[PDB]
Enzyme design. Sequence first.
Site, PDB file in Angstrom:
ATOM      1  N   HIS A   6     -21.493  33.638  99.671  1.00  0.00           N
ATOM      2  CA  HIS A   6     -21.485  34.749  98.721  1.00  0.00           C
ATOM      3  C   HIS A   6     -20.074  34.904  98.132  1.00  0.00           C
ATOM      4  CE1 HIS A   6     -20.959  39.240  98.016  1.00  0.00           C
ATOM      5  NE2 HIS A   6     -21.890  38.907  97.141  1.00  0.00           N
ATOM      6  N   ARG A  58     -18.775  33.515  90.284  1.00  0.00           N
ATOM      7  CA  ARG A  58     -18.729  34.644  89.356  1.00  0.00           C
ATOM      8  C   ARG A  58     -17.549  34.424  88.414  1.00  0.00           C
ATOM      9  NH1 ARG A  58     -21.603  38.872  91.579  1.00  0.00           N
ATOM     10  NH2 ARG A  58     -23.055  38.083  93.172  1.00  0.00           N
ATOM     11  N   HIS A  77     -13.963  38.764  90.823  1.00  0.00           N
ATOM     12  CA  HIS A  77     -14.772  39.549  91.740  1.00  0.00           C
ATOM     13  C   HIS A  77     -14.482  40.925  91.173  1.00  0.00           C
ATOM     14  CE1 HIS A  77     -16.214  40.645  96.079  1.00  0.00           C
ATOM     15  NE2 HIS A  77     -17.095  40.921  95.133  1.00  0.00           N
ATOM     16  N   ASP A  99     -21.418  35.706 103.939  1.00  0.00           N
ATOM     17  CA  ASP A  99     -19.994  35.961 103.787  1.00  0.00           C
ATOM     18  C   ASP A  99     -19.330  35.248 104.959  1.00  0.00           C
ATOM     19  OD1 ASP A  99     -20.016  37.575 101.556  1.00  0.00           O
ATOM     20  OD2 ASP A  99     -19.835  39.458 102.680  1.00  0.00           O
TER      21      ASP A  99
HETATM   22 MN   LIG Z   1     -19.435  40.816  94.895  1.00  0.00          MN
END
Ligand SMILES: [Mn+2]
EC number: 4.6.1.13
Length: 296
Positions: A32, A69, A82, A274
């Site tokens: 993640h 991301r 992030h 994570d």
């Molecule tokens: Mn996040």
Amino acid sequence: ASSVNELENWSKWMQPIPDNIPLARISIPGTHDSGTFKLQNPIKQVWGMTQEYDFRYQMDHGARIFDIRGRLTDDNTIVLHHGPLYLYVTLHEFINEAKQFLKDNPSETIIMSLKKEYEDMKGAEGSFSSTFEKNYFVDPIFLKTEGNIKLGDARGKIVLLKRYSGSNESGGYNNFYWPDNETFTTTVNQNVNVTVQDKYKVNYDEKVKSIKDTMDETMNNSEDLNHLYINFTSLSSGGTAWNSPSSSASSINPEIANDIKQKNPTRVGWVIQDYINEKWSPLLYQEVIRANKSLI
Ligand SMILES: [Mn+2]
Ligand SMILES: [Mn+2]
Ligand SMILES: [Mn+2]
């Protein structure tokens, strides 16, 4: 030819799996917010750090799914973020690491989830989608076919998982309605059913029950070759040293890993976690990989 112990090679665990198995059927470990490993400021870490090590460490530990991301810059490039935090990592950086790993271990495939994390910088010539396609996706490394993607066709390439709108090129898993902080089901690539548990902001107990519930459904639907299960064990930060993603993962990861270890299931889904490391045992990602014993 092919033995169960071959799954123990974290760098080549997909090797023993037959080419005809759909990626959706394989139980795959993922990370993640994969690019947050360079954050050093204590305040940024408590709120936004989700991984302690870089992409290659993640890959050599068995991770095959990456949650990238990014943000579009004014220079026609995509850099990782992030929230409003720049991660000191770029999209080209990730792709290059994946390429080297795929070169060293051609039996594997890398699944890259891509989502827009922050609003484009003013002055960009194109959009997030157009820029990614023109300056990155054109690379032959990216798989260009879709459907219920099979391992055989994915080996040696990066399989895109779109979480952005406006796409215009083919290849990978298409974008779909992804409601916020929920467990939901929908379809992808027309012939693939998908179930996602992504309750990133619920209380601890609710999160653990949600992970187990979705994993229970996955373990009991082991022959459904066209159903995709994505289970996020990660939880958003509470802002303290006791509810940071690091602390949350230190308790959730071993708990879920133990469930799998005790049950010894034949399928657990795409488990995105994570902090992939070797501190807390049992280790979730290793148990997820071992759940592929029946595919051999
Ligand atoms: Mn996040
Ligand atoms: Mn490194
Ligand atoms: Mn189904």
